[PDB]
Design a protein around this ligand. Structure first.
Ligand SMILES: NCCCNc1ccccc1[N+](=O)[O-]
Length: 118
């Protein structure tokens, strides 16, 4: 269509733009701990270290209704899942690598769609 790769302004465009990212983040090998919502016990203290609980189980649920149509909105949620994940799980299990891996692909994806916030 056009020759642009950094302007997720329109909601209709950013709509599927995030759908593709979330769609991949869900199919990504590193995306189990986010698929299922982590209770407030199975995790090494969660209600305490986590002030803004967030999981892929609720993200796609909101995306389907076009809830993320801005920039830091979707970028914040995704980061919330990875950043908060490591926060509760000490850098020792394999979950740490999963977030870092899916977090790397995510950053690259928004770079291709034009998301990114900083
Ligand atoms: N399988 C339930 C969601 C992931 N489980 C979980 C729960 C709490 C803490 C960490 C993990 N985890 O690394 O899979």
């Amino acid at each position: 269509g056009s020759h642009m790769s950094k302007e997720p302004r329109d909601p209709d465009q950013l709509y599927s733009t995030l759908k593709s990212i979330l769609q991949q983040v869900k199919s990504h090998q590193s995306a189990w701990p986010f698929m299922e919502p982590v209770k407030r016990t199975e995790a090494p203290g969660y209600y305490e270290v986590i002030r803004f609980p967030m999981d892929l189980k609720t993200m796609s649920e909101r995306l389907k209704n076009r809830y993320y149509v801005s920039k830091k909105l979707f970028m914040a949620d995704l980061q919330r899942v990875f950043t908060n994940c490591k926060e509760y799980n000490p850098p020792e299990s394999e979950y740490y690598k999963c977030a870092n891996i899916l977090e790397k692909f995510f950053f690259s994806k928004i770079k291709e769609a034009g998301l990114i916030d900083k």
